[PDB]
Design an enzyme around this catalytic site. Sequence first.
Site, PDB file in Angstrom:
ATOM      1  N   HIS A  63       0.828  -1.215   0.000  1.00 51.47           N
ATOM      2  CA  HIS A  63       0.000   0.000   0.000  1.00 51.47           C
ATOM      3  C   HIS A  63       0.855   1.254   0.000  1.00 51.47           C
ATOM      4  O   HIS A  63       1.885   1.317   0.651  1.00 51.47           O
ATOM      5  CB  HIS A  63      -0.951   0.041   1.201  1.00 51.47           C
ATOM      6  CG  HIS A  63      -1.917  -1.103   1.242  1.00 51.47           C
ATOM      7  ND1 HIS A  63      -2.161  -1.820   2.389  1.00 51.47           N
ATOM      8  CD2 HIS A  63      -2.667  -1.678   0.270  1.00 51.47           C
ATOM      9  CE1 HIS A  63      -3.056  -2.763   2.134  1.00 51.47           C
ATOM     10  NE2 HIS A  63      -3.373  -2.701   0.851  1.00 51.47           N
ATOM     11  N   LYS A  73       4.573   7.047   8.003  1.00 51.27           N
ATOM     12  CA  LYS A  73       3.959   6.227   9.004  1.00 51.27           C
ATOM     13  C   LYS A  73       4.970   5.731  10.004  1.00 51.27           C
ATOM     14  O   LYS A  73       6.190   5.676   9.708  1.00 51.27           O
ATOM     15  CB  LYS A  73       3.257   5.008   8.364  1.00 51.27           C
ATOM     16  CG  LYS A  73       2.007   5.412   7.520  1.00 51.27           C
ATOM     17  CD  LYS A  73       1.545   4.295   6.583  1.00 51.27           C
ATOM     18  CE  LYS A  73       0.364   4.783   5.760  1.00 51.27           C
ATOM     19  NZ  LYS A  73      -0.248   3.668   4.958  1.00 51.27           N
ATOM     20  N   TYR A 133      -0.437   1.759  14.133  1.00 51.12           N
ATOM     21  CA  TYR A 133       0.185   2.829  13.333  1.00 51.12           C
ATOM     22  C   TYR A 133      -0.162   4.216  13.834  1.00 51.12           C
ATOM     23  O   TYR A 133      -1.277   4.448  14.272  1.00 51.12           O
ATOM     24  CB  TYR A 133      -0.323   2.845  11.864  1.00 51.12           C
ATOM     25  CG  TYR A 133      -0.237   1.576  11.016  1.00 51.12           C
ATOM     26  CD1 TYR A 133       0.591   1.530   9.904  1.00 51.12           C
ATOM     27  CD2 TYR A 133      -1.049   0.462  11.266  1.00 51.12           C
ATOM     28  CE1 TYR A 133       0.634   0.411   9.073  1.00 51.12           C
ATOM     29  CE2 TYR A 133      -1.039  -0.655  10.413  1.00 51.12           C
ATOM     30  CZ  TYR A 133      -0.169  -0.687   9.340  1.00 51.12           C
ATOM     31  OH  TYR A 133      -0.092  -1.791   8.503  1.00 51.12           O
ATOM     32  N   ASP A 170      -6.069  -5.855  -3.199  1.00 53.39           N
ATOM     33  CA  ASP A 170      -4.655  -6.250  -3.176  1.00 53.39           C
ATOM     34  C   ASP A 170      -4.332  -7.387  -4.155  1.00 53.39           C
ATOM     35  O   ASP A 170      -3.230  -7.429  -4.723  1.00 53.39           O
ATOM     36  CB  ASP A 170      -4.264  -6.672  -1.771  1.00 53.39           C
ATOM     37  CG  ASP A 170      -4.157  -5.495  -0.821  1.00 53.39           C
ATOM     38  OD1 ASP A 170      -4.289  -4.320  -1.284  1.00 53.39           O
ATOM     39  OD2 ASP A 170      -3.926  -5.765   0.391  1.00 53.39           O
TER      40      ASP A 170
END
Lengths: 205, 205
Positions: A63, A73, A133, A170
């Site tokens: 991603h 991130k 995250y 995905d």
Amino acid sequence: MQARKLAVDGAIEFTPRVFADDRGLLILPYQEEAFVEAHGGPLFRVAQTIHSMSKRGVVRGIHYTVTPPGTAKYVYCARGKAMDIVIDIRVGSPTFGQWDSVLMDQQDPRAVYLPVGVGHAFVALEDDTVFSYMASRSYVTQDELALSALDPALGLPIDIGVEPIVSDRDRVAITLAEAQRQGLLPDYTTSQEIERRLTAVPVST
Amino acid sequence: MQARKLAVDGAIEFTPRVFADDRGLLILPYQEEAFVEAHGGPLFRVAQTIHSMSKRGVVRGIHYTVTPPGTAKYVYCARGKAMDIVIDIRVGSPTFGQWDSVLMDQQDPRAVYLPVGVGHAFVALEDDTVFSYMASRSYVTQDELALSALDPALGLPIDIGVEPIVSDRDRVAITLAEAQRQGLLPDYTTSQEIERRLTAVPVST
């Protein structure tokens, strides 16, 4: 806290200590002093946090976020076990096309800083595997893009013996090579510029 | 995301949605838009994160930070079940001496914003109960102080039938009333001033 600069330019693995007592456990997965010393500036301002749990054999990724705006991130594995993977998809990068892996697990927990413009993927090795995250940007399905994590040109370490458990999105993702052909990939220079603005040191009295 | 302003002035409970699919689960425990709308400004800059796991019957708290400097926190319960408790220890506050509880659990997960100057305590109702924090300040045992969570004047909801599992430090903590007598408690005005500086909106082009 230990810090290890990964081969993917600007990516960093941090190893917090696990403090254990009669009551349970304490870990400090993100720590400003260690981070500033490794990266050169503090964490981005936190716009959103993510709590993700996966079953064994789930593969999520690759991603990334359309850049600009981009997203940086910081992820730690809060439960279970995973092979975590940073993929350098920034065209112009000295490590373009390179990936790095971090073994995430509860016995030796690890956190990963992901720069603006890099792709992220992982495989969960156990049920109830939790990724936690902080992100520099709120999530817009919009600007959120996928590349094929099972792509043979990549040889990512994502196979664990069983059929990968993957979202339709995905599963049908275009390859890295196709995305580059089409001009969909982050630019390295642009990514770096955004990243420096995001993680700018506060300069006060 | 739903937000609920708690009785303790400035404290907020946020209720994220749990998105579930074949792969597992996704929650967004901190979200800028919902937070700014509830609080009036964005989260503080993140100086440190905390991952804490507790056994059943563990009571931690009441913990607070000498103010100034003070600390604001944002906590979600990432695993297990807890009674979480905000105690207003800011002398001058319209809700001074008040506490509020949030039932933290995996079925209806909750996040709590804790203002500068408030105390925090909780009881773990299950083994492997995990609290995940962002904090505005790195931890100095220094400036980190405790009050008696089992104090009878308080009547906090911290008893679950079994002997509390408590650190020696938390077990021997002075009372709220004793701390006030000695001038050890945060001031409400000062706390508010620090909080407004911490959560100041970024003002750009």
